[PDB]
Amino acid sequence: VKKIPTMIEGFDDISHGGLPQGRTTLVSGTSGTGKTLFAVQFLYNGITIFNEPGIFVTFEESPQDIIKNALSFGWNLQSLIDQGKLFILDASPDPDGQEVAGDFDLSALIERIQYAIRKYKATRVSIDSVTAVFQQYDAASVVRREIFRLAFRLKQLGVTTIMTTEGPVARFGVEEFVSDNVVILRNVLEGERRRRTVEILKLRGTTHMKGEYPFTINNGINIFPLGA
Amino acid sequence: VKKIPTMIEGFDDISHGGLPQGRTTLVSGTSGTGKTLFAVQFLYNGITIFNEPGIFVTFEESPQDIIKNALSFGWNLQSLIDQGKLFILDASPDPDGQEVAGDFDLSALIERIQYAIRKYKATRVSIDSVTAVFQQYDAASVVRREIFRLAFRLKQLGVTTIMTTEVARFGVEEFVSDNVVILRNVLEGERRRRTVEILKLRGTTHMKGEYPFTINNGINIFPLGA
Amino acid sequence: KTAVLKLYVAGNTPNSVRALKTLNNILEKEFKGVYALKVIDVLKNPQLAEEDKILATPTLAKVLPPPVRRIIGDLSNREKVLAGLDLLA
Amino acid sequence: TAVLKLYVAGNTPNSVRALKTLNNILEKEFKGVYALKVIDVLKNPQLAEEDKILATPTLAKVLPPPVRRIIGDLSNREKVLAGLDLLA
Amino acid sequence: TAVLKLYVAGNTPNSVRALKTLNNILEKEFKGVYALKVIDVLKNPQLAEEDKILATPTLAKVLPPPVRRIIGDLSNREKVLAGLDLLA
Amino acid sequence: KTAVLKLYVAGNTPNSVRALKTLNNILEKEFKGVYALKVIDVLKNPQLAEEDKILATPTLAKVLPPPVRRIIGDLSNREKVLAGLDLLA
Amino acid sequence: TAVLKLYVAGNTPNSVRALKTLNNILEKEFKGVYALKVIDVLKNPQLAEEDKILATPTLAKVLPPPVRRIIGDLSNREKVLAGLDLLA
Amino acid sequence: KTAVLKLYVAGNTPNSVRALKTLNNILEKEFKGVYALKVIDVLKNPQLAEEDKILATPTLAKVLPPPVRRIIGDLSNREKVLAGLDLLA
Ligand SMILES: Nc1ncnc2c1ncn2[C@@H]1O[C@H](COP(=O)(O)OP(=O)(O)O)[C@@H](O)[C@H]1O
Numbered sequence: 001v002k003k004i005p006t007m008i009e010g011f012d013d014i015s016h017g018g019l020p021q022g023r024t025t026l027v028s029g030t031s032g033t034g035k036t037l038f039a040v041q042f043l044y045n046g047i048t049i050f051n052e053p054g055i056f057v058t059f060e061e062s063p064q065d066i067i068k069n070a071l072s073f074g075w076n077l078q079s080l081i082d083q084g085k086l087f088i089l090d091a092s093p094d095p096d097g098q099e100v101a102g103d104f105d106l107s108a109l110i111e112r113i114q115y116a117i118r119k120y121k122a123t124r125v126s127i128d129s130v131t132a133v134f135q136q137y138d139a140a141s142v143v144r145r146e147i148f149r150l151a152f153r154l155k156q157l158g159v160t161t162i163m164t165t166e167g168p169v170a171r172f173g174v175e176e177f178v179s180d181n182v183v184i185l186r187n188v189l190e191g192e193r194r195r196r197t198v199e200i201l202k203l204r205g206t207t208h209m210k211g212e213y214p215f216t217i218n219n220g221i222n223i224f225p226l227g228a
Numbered sequence: 229v230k231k232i233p234t235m236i237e238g239f240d241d242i243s244h245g246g247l248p249q250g251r252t253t254l255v256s257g258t259s260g261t262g263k264t265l266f267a268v269q270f271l272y273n274g275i276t277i278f279n280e281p282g283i284f285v286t287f288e289e290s291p292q293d294i295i296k297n298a299l300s301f302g303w304n305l306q307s308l309i310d311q312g313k314l315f316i317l318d319a320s321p322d323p324d325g326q327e328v329a330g331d332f333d334l335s336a337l338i339e340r341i342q343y344a345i346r347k348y349k350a351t352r353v354s355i356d357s358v359t360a361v362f363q364q365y366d367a368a369s370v371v372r373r374e375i376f377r378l379a380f381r382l383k384q385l386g387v388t389t390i391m392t393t394e395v396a397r398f399g400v401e402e403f404v405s406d407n408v409v410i411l412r413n414v415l416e417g418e419r420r421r422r423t424v425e426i427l428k429l430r431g432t433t434h435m436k437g438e439y440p441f442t443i444n445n446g447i448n449i450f451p452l453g454a
Numbered sequence: 455k456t457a458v459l460k461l462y463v464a465g466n467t468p469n470s471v472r473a474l475k476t477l478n479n480i481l482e483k484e485f486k487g488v489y490a491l492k493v494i495d496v497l498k499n500p501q502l503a504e505e506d507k508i509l510a511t512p513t514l515a516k517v518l519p520p521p522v523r524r525i526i527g528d529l530s531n532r533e534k535v536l537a538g539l540d541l542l543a
Numbered sequence: 544t545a546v547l548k549l550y551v552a553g554n555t556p557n558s559v560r561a562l563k564t565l566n567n568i569l570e571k572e573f574k575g576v577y578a579l580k581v582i583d584v585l586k587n588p589q590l591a592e593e594d595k596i597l598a599t600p601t602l603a604k605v606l607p608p609p610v611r612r613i614i615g616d617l618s619n620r621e622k623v624l625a626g627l628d629l630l631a
Numbered sequence: 632t633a634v635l636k637l638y639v640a641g642n643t644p645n646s647v648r649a650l651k652t653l654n655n656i657l658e659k660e661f662k663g664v665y666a667l668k669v670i671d672v673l674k675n676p677q678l679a680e681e682d683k684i685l686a687t688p689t690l691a692k693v694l695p696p697p698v699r700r701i702i703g704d705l706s707n708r709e710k711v712l713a714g715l716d717l718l719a
Numbered sequence: 720k721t722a723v724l725k726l727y728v729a730g731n732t733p734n735s736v737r738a739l740k741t742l743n744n745i746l747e748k749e750f751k752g753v754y755a756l757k758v759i760d761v762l763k764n765p766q767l768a769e770e771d772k773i774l775a776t777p778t779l780a781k782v783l784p785p786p787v788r789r790i791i792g793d794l795s796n797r798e799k800v801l802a803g804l805d806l807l808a
Numbered sequence: 809t810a811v812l813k814l815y816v817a818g819n820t821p822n823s824v825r826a827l828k829t830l831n832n833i834l835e836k837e838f839k840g841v842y843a844l845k846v847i848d849v850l851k852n853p854q855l856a857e858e859d860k861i862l863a864t865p866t867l868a869k870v871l872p873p874p875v876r877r878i879i880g881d882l883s884n885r886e887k888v889l890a891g892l893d894l895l896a
Numbered sequence: 897k898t899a900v901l902k903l904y905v906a907g908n909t910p911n912s913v914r915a916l917k918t919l920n921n922i923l924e925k926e927f928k929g930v931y932a933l934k935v936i937d938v939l940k941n942p943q944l945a946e947e948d949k950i951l952a953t954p955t956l957a958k959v960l961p962p963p964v965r966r967i968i969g970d971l972s973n974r975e976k977v978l979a980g981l982d983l984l985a
């Protein structure tokens with residue numbers, strides 16, 4: 001049995017030592033709950049504390065805007081990225097969109113990822129919004145298969161990896177089942193207020209904390225439930 | 229008539245004698261509720277207490293990853309496989325995926341199963357996530373036929389078998405079977421309670437309802453005696 | 455060169471001699487001899503099917519020379535097999 | 544200064560479909576629209592990343608106008624033979 | 632010792648479709664694959680029950696291999712003329 | 720022998736002389752004479768339609784010789800009527 | 809006393825489709841089934857209202873039997889050339 | 897008489913020279929000369945596209961002589977343009 005630290009303010013102790021290693025971790029929530037942020041903060045903890053080099057893969061967002069995103073909490077990346085920090089794989093859509101004359105195998109992306117890793121010594125990689133890839137290419141068949149070959153490749157390489165994907169509590173598996181341990185971040189609306197909470201359904205073949213617990217954001221995501 | 233023990237902590241008495249025998253029992257719950265666990269631990273219970281060899285069929289999970297699973301409970305299976313006792317059948321999809329040029333007769337899998345059993349003399353079989361083939365093969369037509377001939381073939385062989393399938397709903401095109409346990413994970417207030425409901429065993433003494441449970445080294449359950 | 459392709463069949467089930475009939479003519483009418491064949495009656499020697507861990511019938515082809523791939527089914531649909539034939543370039 | 548560039552994944556079926564149909568375009572329609580470049584992105588993907596590709600087989604063109612890139616099997620002969628052109 | 636057996640429902644349309652197309656198979660493809668038996672299950676259904684049939688028109692075959700039974704109009708000429716065969 | 724078929728029509732509604740036009744040529748081009756016909760203008764003698772308790776127009780055919788059956792509609796689709804013709808065997 | 813009457817909307821495309829195909833019917837099938845009347849309902853719609861029409865292009869017929877009215881582009885040549893007829 | 901038709905294009909985007917290629921042959925193979933044309937590269941003179949307040953590319957045709965109408969798209973589908981051609985009657 002394996003395990004890896006994260007030290008997000010108060011998350012790790014629920015996972016009793018953090019994320020699984022060499023295994024694919026999927027993170028899902030409704031739009032607007034800081035999934036991408038969770039990925040960013042995760043990997044930034046990694047490289048800053050453990051010097052566990054990172055790859056941030058982005059479909060939805062543009063790099064310049066993800067750095068201007070993260071710079072809000074007081075993290076300056078590109079100048080420090082010159083150190084050989086984290087590498088942002090740009091998978092933002094060609095604005096001109098694309099035309100199709102046949103089906104594709106997304107080998108370009110996965111192989112690009114693994115060169116990026118084997119260049120950056122990376123042991124940790126996050127991946128922002130796969131549903132966008134389902135809404136990027138209107139072929140819902142293959143993207144399942146090639147996301148699967150990605151996650152499997154990452155399990156082979158033994159790297160820690162994260163996936164972000166898009167009604168909270170009710171029927172929530174989004175559209176991309178295909179993963180091996182799952183965190184679900186939901187923010188519920190009751191009366192006329194908002195409670196941001198984290199549920200971990202279960203972490204497969206590993207200790208996990210029992211149930212869902214509310215959280216809020218600061219410079220990095222925080223909550224500390226359990227005392228005693 | 230007849231039934232077979234599970235000797236998993238506190239389930240056996242809910243079923244009033246454990247799982248049925250010579251019949252295929254379906255185990256279903258929403259994803260993330262430890263169905264796979266129930267199956268693995270079922271065959272491990274069989275083999276460790278009775279020396280009743282088992283065949284564990286796995287699509288979703290990876291074999292080595294099922295053993296790295298089980299080492300959490302402190303059990304060495306690879307030693308048990310080399311002992312010639314339990315066999316973990318790898319029916320996981322080739323990551324390279326599939327291309328299709330026609331209809332299937334899914335004889336290959338079933339023949340693999342029955343060769344595995346008739347070699348290991350196995351009396352226990354788990355099948356984790358038939359649903360995976362549905363997430364593999366887009367033909368909901370034939371899998372009907374081949375699941376039925378599978379479960380039936382197993383009843384010829386008379387071995388006890390388990391099928392796992394993917395809140396308070398039905399069975400998501402899994403087709404009725406002849407005895408069914410639905411273990412449900414409930415979300416109430418702002419905490420979550422894992423419970424086991426056992427829906428039916430046809431022609432057999434049975435306990436009434438849903439019953440709360442938690443996990444240790446093996447699944448633990450809370451019956452009611454005295 | 456030295457192209458290889460190997461097939462898994464279920465005895466003489468209808469779908470699969472559909473498959474074989476339609477196949478042999480494909481493999482020696484297009485080109486007489488890329489490569490000969492092996493047929494596997496998984497009904498009376500299935501442990502070979504198990505060590506290759508194949509799952510379905512009729513399951514066709516071979517993954518050498520590169521890459522590792524390959525295709526299952528009725529094989530009536532000639533287009534997909536002649537789209538999945540490799541070699542030449 | 545004719546130019547045309549193509550991206551492939553080793554020898555995946557989709558990409559030899561692609562290559563066959565492409566070269567056959569290049570020697571049924573017009574012999575020399577533009578020279579060619581083929582890339583097995585498996586052992587030189589940094590080129591694919593400078594090209595910022597995400598999918599295979601990706602066929603692309605820069606000058607003459609416009610700067611363009613279309614992906615796939617290149618099975619749909621109609622749209623790709625509609626996606627040739629020039630005039631200016 | 633050639634054998635082939637067929638089950639019909641009196642003279643329902645589906646079953647004279649079936650019979651026409653069947654005999655025409657039997658005298659366009661091969662004159663004598665196997666002798667025949669036709670059963671109007673309306674006045675001898677105990678034969679249908681020993682055959683444990685549920686549907687009409689049900690066409691079946693026992694030896695040479697394998698033991699087999701297919702049902703219907705036998706309109707889909709492709710699959711039934713694919714469901715003939717032998718070799719062994 | 721002595722084959723019988725009888726038809727119910729609605730005067731001269733479009734669908735039903737579509738039906739009759741397309742029909743008569745079917746009944747005497749395939750085979751000139753299996754059997755002659757009866758046409759029923761249910762608009763001005765409907766009690767015959769009521770004693771036969773028929774419900775729709777255009778409603779075609781007859782249920783003797785066996786079995787009791789028979790078919791309704793536009794009858795443009797020649798396939799289904801030549802699939803529903805009985806006799807010969 | 810042959811009669812046939814037609815309703816159009818000025819020169820909307822649907823209605824010159826309609827008119828073309830109609831006159832071509834009238835001079836491919838039968839030269840003179842029935843005389844004709846065409847109405848640009850834009851500057852004499854009271855005629856359309858006495859005809860109680862709701863849609864264009866509306867093609868109609870009164871005697872010989874029956875009293876009838878069918879609408880549209882008259883593109884579906886099959887059903888309209890099936891909606892001619894007479895005999896009685 | 898004096899028939900008019902005018903077109904809005906987006907420079908040399910694929911869809912739109914698809915459109916133009918397919919179009920010019922329509923406009924001078926059916927009939928050599930109903931009427932000549934105007935093409936508008938909305939990429940480098942768009943205020944004409946804005947005063948006509950057109951919204952899409954490739955946007956085809958003209959609304960005089962009557963009525964005011966007209967059609968957009970790939971224009972591969974020859975049927976709809978030869979269904980939308982007006983004149984003659
Ligand atoms: N200073 C801040 N205070 C509170 N919330 C912030 C601050 N900066 C960013 N956020 C939150 O971060 C979130 C971004 O995450 P989200 O909306 O889920 O986008 P994504 O889906 O890309 O993660 C926003 O919802 C925003 O409310």
Ligand SMILES: Nc1ncnc2c1ncn2[C@@H]1O[C@H](COP(=O)(O)OP(=O)(O)O)[C@@H](O)[C@H]1O
Pocket residue numbers: 202203204205206207208257258259260261262263264265297300301443444
């Ligand atoms: N330390 C542990 N505590 C509790 N359960 C564990 C532990 N280690 C492994 N497991 C079990 O291993 C199981 C793997 O099965 P899983 O695939 O999660 O079932 P499901 O199909 O319901 O998701 C988990 O459900 C979990 O119950």
